[PDB]
């Protein structure tokens, strides 16, 4: 019967948000160590230098290898000890922040993540997805707390190419949707209890902004412009999406965007726009209104979201890789089992085909 509700400590936005990293990482600690790639110690490094003016033995800069790793976490930790870090900062993509989270946690020390993009809502999460060092997928690490701080500068967010944008609008899409099921089945979220009335109502507010704004948000963002938009949907991609899974529940969407790993076409798509089709697949499986998928059909279309298989690179429908997608989407643990009636790989199969000819229809149609 508990409800929970997980949140990071502070989540921050603002243009040349980075320029004050030291007045956010002297709040936490006095000596930061800062986690970033090559490409992205490049892009942000003399701000960051510039920001400790005054302050410049209170951080140090290390420069990260490029996969979330055993290995890699270890050697960040241990340099980290060594120079007697006392908070960690993560600034880049998904794997960069993912490592920086694992090494608070491993050192005992709070965490900032700081995106450089704003494609996934992953940021937010207790969650840190280890690879193998050959870059195959090895464990999804729970941690205790949910970062820190998150930090979006959304001027550096805005010189990102758009499509990543546009792709954090496809995962935001889902998690209303989701949220929605895992209430409506009175089953568990990430965050550990049943579904708070403010996870609830991030979520809607997130699918909400989605429709409202992504549309004036992209246009800005192709032009890496950052306008009133692009800082409501920077925000609804990363807070409220992400307090609205994490807090609110996955379930058929996520799901489904797992099992189309199988199609080796859809690889080079990335995680948000997979999380798009897979949002169609489940109000197909769940049977929403038909305006409702049209209101989705739609705003997808509008920002250039994949709505068919098609979209994802597949060009031709196969049973035989298709039933694998939809049994794997089915897999023992899986998030697809939040939706509240009974689900087989048949029903997910029948609801990942008719996605697909509902989205060919409206693409034709319209």
């Not at 192709?222 to 409220?240: D, F, G, P, Q, S």
Request: with cysteine; hydrophobic share 40%; aromatic share 8%.
């Amino acid at each position: 019967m508990t409800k929970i509700i997980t949140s990071p400590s502070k989540f921050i936005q603002g243009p040349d948000e980075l320029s004050r990293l030291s007045a956010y990482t002297e709040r936490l600690g006095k000596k930061a160590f800062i986690i970033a790639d090559d490409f992205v110690t490049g892009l942000v490094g003399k701000t960051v230098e510039e920001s400790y003016a005054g302050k410049e033995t209170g951080y140090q800069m290390a420069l990260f290898g490029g996969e979330c790793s055993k290995p890699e976490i270890e050697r960040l930790c241990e340099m980290s000890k060594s120079e007697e870090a006392d908070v960690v900062v993560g600034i880049g993509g998904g794997k960069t922040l993912d490592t920086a989270k694992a090494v608070g946690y491993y050192n005992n020390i709070p965490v900032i993540v700081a995106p450089t993009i704003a494609s996934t809502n992953a940021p937010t999460s207790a969650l840190s997805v280890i690879y193998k060092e050959n870059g195959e997928f090895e464990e999804y690490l729970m941690l205790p707390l949910n970062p820190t701080f998150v930090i979006m500068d959304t001027k550096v967010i805005a010189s990102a190419p758009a499509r990543l944008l546009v792709s954090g609008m496809g995962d935001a899409l889902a998690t209303y949707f989701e949220a929605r099921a895992t209430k409506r089945a009175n089953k568990t979220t990430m965050a550990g209890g049943r579904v708070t009335e403010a996870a609830i109502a991030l979520a809607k507010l997130c699918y909400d902004t989605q429709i409202l704004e992504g549309l004036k948000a992209k246009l800005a963002a192709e032009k890496h412009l950052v306008t009133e938009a692009v800082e409501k949907i920077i925000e609804a991609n990363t807070y409220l999406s992400g307090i609205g899974s994490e807090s609110g529940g996955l379930a058929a969407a996520h799901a489904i965007h797992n099992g189309l790993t199988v199609l080796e076409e859809t690889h080079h798509m990335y995680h948000g726009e997979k999380v798009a089709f897979g949002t169609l697949a489940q109000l197909i499986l769940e049977d929403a209104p038909k305006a409702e998928i049209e209101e989705v059909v739609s705003f997808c279309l509008s920002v250039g979201l994949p709505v068919t298989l098609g979209d994802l690179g597949v060009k031709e429908l196969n049973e035989e890789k298709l039933r694998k997608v939809a049994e794997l989407s089915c897999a023992e643990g899986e998030t697809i089992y939040n939706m509240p009636f009974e689900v087989t790989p048949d029903l997910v199969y029948a609801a990942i085909v008719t996605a697909d000819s509902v989205g060919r229809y409206y693409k034709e149609k319209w």
